[PDB]
Structure 1
Amino acid sequence: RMVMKLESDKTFPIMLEGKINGYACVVGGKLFRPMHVEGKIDNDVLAALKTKKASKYDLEYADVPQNMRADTFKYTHEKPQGYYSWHHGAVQYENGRFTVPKGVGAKGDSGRPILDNQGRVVAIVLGGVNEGSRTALSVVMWNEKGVTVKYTPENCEQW
């Protein structure tokens, strides 16, 4: 209950085959979307916006127009131990790794952002690997120096 009401409309699904295959998020003035999602953004203005490829980090980033910089997610560089809000449920940050309960998260859920209890994005996911009773996530976050450390678990199944 407490984790699902943290709803923000800044995320935009990507449309192709006429079905949902991923989410692209506007954070801190930049639009992020993964490689593996194909299609056009639901918002036409961002759909027509050119993107720059970053294959080794696995995210296209696009410069949002200056008018829309006012309403965007707030990035975070500190990652305190413990649980965090998400679209589905609580996500546990432990031992420098983001984990979700069994079954939560599947194909078409890639690109969704992990926020904190404060209400601002702390990382964005690109895929998930099932470790058993608890499922680990392939996720990219932000550091204090803005070096954008990417954490990719072993043989991660790509969402």
Structure 2
Amino acid sequence: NDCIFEVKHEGKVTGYACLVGDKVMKPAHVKGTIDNADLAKLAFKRSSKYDLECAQIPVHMKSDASKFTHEKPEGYYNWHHGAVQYSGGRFTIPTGAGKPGDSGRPIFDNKGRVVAIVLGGANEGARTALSVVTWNKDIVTKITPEGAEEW
């Protein structure tokens, strides 16, 4: 908890950055500066392949990074604005729960561990598909529902 930092544009809030494990991650589609000067001055590696900008956490002064896991069992997860249903290879939320500007928020399991980062979603009718970034035991991978857009 309380591991979320704001990313701000010149005239508005644009997205969020999160401290997970040993690295700090933000969506590459979010254009702005991190509110925390300690992270704002930190260099990031940009990869358009996964829509990520990542950097190492100054753990010597930032020991409050969240716990994380590569495990993705079926069930419900906590994504701040409510519960998210996970089944198969997709995360699903209520249609009125999602919004633009919410990108960068992590999804937590029942142990408080981060499993994925939210980039956006797609309207599937009664439910909205959630577009997220997750990882396996070795490397990071991205999940992109059809018709999904950045938030």
Aligned counterpart for 2:32 among listed residues 27, 35, 39 = 39
CA RMSD of aligned residues (A): 1.2
Q: Deviations over 1:20-54 (max 9, x none)?
A: 22111111111111122111101101001011111
Q: Alpha-carbon deviation of 1:70?
A: 2.6
* Aligned counterparts of 1:16 and 1:137: Cα–Cα separation in 2: 24
| Structure 2, gaps ≥5 residues long | none
Aligned-partner Cα distance in 2 for 1:29–1:68: 12
The one-letter amino acid paired with 1:85 is N
Counterpart code for 1:66: V
Secondary structure of 1:104 counterpart: coil
Q: Indicate if the aligned counterparts of 1:28 and 1:69 stay in contact, CA closer than 8 A.
A: no
Measured in 2, the distance between the counterparts of 1:120 and 1:137 equals 18
Query: 1:56-67 alignment to 2 at 5 Å?
Result: 56-67=49-60
Per-residue CA shift, 1:112-132, capped at 9, x if unaligned?
100011111111111111111
- Whether the aligned pair in 2 keeps the contact of 1:75 and 1:142 (CA below 8 Å) is no
Q: 2:114 aligns with which of 109, 121, 144?
A: 121
Aligned to 1:133: 126
Distance 1:151 1:131 in 2: 16
Q: Secondary structure at the match of 2:38?
A: helix
Equivalent of 1:84, from 73, 77, 81? 77
User: Which residue of structure 2 aligns with residue 142 of structure 1?
Assistant: 135
Q: Which amino acid aligns with 1:62?
A: A
SS in 2 for 1:45: helix
Structure 1 or 2: larger strand share?
Answer: 2
The aligned counterpart of 1:18 is 11
Structure 1 alignment gaps of length 5 or more: 1-7
1:103 equivalenced with 2:96 (yes/no): yes
1:102 offset after TM fit, Å? 1.6
